[PDB]
Symmetry: D3
Subunit: 189 residues, 6 copies
């Protein structure tokens, strides 16, 4: 019995989770600050056997970010970003079906994670774990981890949000700690 | 009478809001991923007349981030960051006392904002406004803006979180839109 | 200014409200009771200027209900039902944008209503009114009424669910109280 | 050992669940739509060894419903309805004590069910199941089933509401699927 | 318009508020500690025009309390208690209909109060005021005050609990701050 | 492993629970009722290996309480109170870390306890148990017991509040039911 099989029958948001509002601000051609768009995000991707849906709320591809000509908005909208942009950022929101586990993986990236709804178990490859509840924040520094939805004893969906930044390769005793994705590689090709 | 006057009496968290847990992961000498610390953030700063309190959960000063020797941790904890870091990031959580309202201002920054708890009204300098409830996200693109806590008709506290990133100067029709800190 | 202009930007569900699961049971080869469908409902209809979205959870067009060969399933899915079915039922769920309110209307219908999420004001053409919160239940006996979403002082979406049954024309003082659809 | 033994100690509502409002509208003598009632429902019945309590919010005994002279209100309040009405409807609300199970049963009836509070498990006679959280909707088409209240790992109460309508008898492979009460 | 007119149609609890569980413990004839009762409280009382309902969870009429022979249980169930007991305690829970105000009054007793559900406003005779949300605690030291239910802009019910203990008379510069109940004398003894 | 080991890293409130407002009223020099203080309680005390934290909201030391000259306020602030006060009262609030248990103990006092947030299990020395959810009240009459935090399957913090009053020694079969603190 695979957890969360076919739970996500309508893309984002997953059943039991609220639809969201993404506001994007900008400047008109008279210098006034205006609201450019209100939507449900972008680049909704169904993951696993319909066990989770991802939602890319924004992305940047350069540092510092160029906002003139609304170039940043169109680079974010015209292409589905990969796991992680070099010298840039991605804001990734994921809806988890009940009891759904992500594979133990490592992205070479510093990742600010915040639980938006539910309870999540952050497990590392050393066995160490932390239970993270709503509002809890993590600073994942290119470490090997897996995320586990444990909301209501594995019967409720949960939602998490990540802001992924670029990092240099972590070296420990002259050895580069290599990034790997396991079963998550099929979800970003 | 000033909104939120002497509401925050014990720093972070503000009355009515929950204490947080911040987890920072790292690497041990053998090469396994380990949890380096669990705490309530860093560099708490009272704002206004005890009308708010800020919480700096992390910050980076270069891109790509240098993680070796835990130097990112050291820089993040050594000194309180300014409004915004060139070629870097800041995670800033803020608790608002009831009905507390920020000054109209512009930071030359792109800001990812999420409403962690409460109901906030985002006001831009053109009068355009959007009410933001828990879970709603904004991409503030170097815009002159104002944040208003309106949770439960101005009787409850609210909490926001921003991730502030470095951007180039926004130039509209030849004129640099310069950022002002302002005051109400 | 319209109460909910362009709030519902992605159909059902409305922003701030949860996606649902609709489960339909049935019988298989050898008379085992099984699940036939788990979906988001059927017959989504944007109402107003994206001020509301309606969801038809189920409907029947006859009494008693004919279930053999799954004909009630086919009828319920093959065509979007009207306001109400003669000799039938409709399970219609509606999401209201903030402060959105229905026009003063009458249906020749006995409607069971339950507030699923939010707070609503039910006003009759007499002026009498009642505030209904979650779990509260209404039996509208072919009366002329309004529904006003008032959740969080007009800043939060709400959701109602109705079961609409057919009824005979109500007659007062020899007058048939004619149903009218008001504005919408 | 019994899941909800002696939990419901004051009728409706059960400990941990909210008291409700039921509003019934009607017409006065000059045609104005007015409110006739505000109460806690009707025909409250304790079930089992005080493991649950039912609340009948309304019922109709004919289709289409006859509203004139308020004879429907009279019929709905004068006698406790049975499990279901022929050519009729019943709105039944049930507060489940923690972990309380419903017996495996079948009624010849189409039931619209909505979780009002808590988390329930819907098990059918073939073993298949679906977990239903607040706001989820089920259409029970004369199938054999049970309801298990699993709210907060069996330590919290939950509340369901059903609208039971009449159906024709279900025949599969020439056999009429009989009802039973387990 | 009377704020909570005919809102409490079925006594305790008020519509929109939860029925409760009061557990009372004691000792068996063998010295082991046991649960003596589980119920919805005692001495339910409708206040005003079905505008509120009180629920007296327990009371004591002596200091220190005598628990032998269960005489404190019988004394608490035998009579409905007055506003406050001399040399004793009263745990009074009150369900407020939406927007219901208590009258300005002064009970000569120190009252611990906690908001159980909703948002209440505590206004004092000088006009000073505090908004009290679920979880907040007030220590009422024989002051003249009034409680206002403002839950969800006066459209939702709320619930307060109090523990009323005996105090001496408050004397300010020779003057006795005398008790008075205003409109609330209707609802006691 | 020890439940809640090092969970409460920043005193009161524990991570996951809200900061509180304690309001104390009194009289000014003219005889008007005014608010004397708005704070987070008093006498915060960590318990166990950072597994819980207690917050003494108020206390009295005499019956009836003396309030003139604010003597009761001073007596409540100047000393951290013991387990219970003779002829007096203690309002004790305690924040439990996930899955945290108190030892089987007896205090010779009558305790008015309410669940502020979470779910607790009250186990008595006879093995009988009750599950108490938010808003439920217990009257403890000098009985041997223990408190278990079972909030969200042992993974969430909980909060109780007691009011302890003095009581005469309980005698059962000519033997005094001695109080004891216990050892896990």
């Amino acid at each position: 019995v695979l957890p969360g099989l076919n739970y996500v029958h309508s893309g984002f948001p997953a059943p039991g989770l609220r639809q969201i509002n993404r506001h994007i601000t900008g400047h008109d051609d008279n210098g006034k600050s205006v609201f450019l768009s209100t939507d449900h995000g972008d680049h909704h991707r169904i993951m696993g056997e319909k066990q989770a849906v991802a939602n890319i709320l924004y992305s940047t591809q350069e540092t510092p970010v160029q906002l003139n000509g609304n170039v940043d908005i169109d680079k974010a909208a015209k292409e589905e970003p990969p796991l992680h942009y070099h010298n840039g950022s991605i804001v990734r929101m994921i809806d988890f079906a009940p009891a759904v586990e992500s594979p133990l993986h490592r992205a070479v990236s510093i990742d600010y994670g915040i639980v938006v709804e539910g309870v999540f178990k952050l497990v590392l490859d050393s066995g160490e774990e932390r239970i993270m509840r709503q509002g809890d924040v993590s600073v994942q520094r290119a470490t090997a981890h897996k995320w586990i939805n444990i909301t209501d004893n594995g019967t409720a969906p949960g939602r998490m949000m990540w802001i992924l930044l670029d990092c240099h390769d972590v070296v420990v005793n002259g050895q580069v700690m290599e990034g790997y994705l396991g079963d998550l590689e099929k979800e970003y090709v």
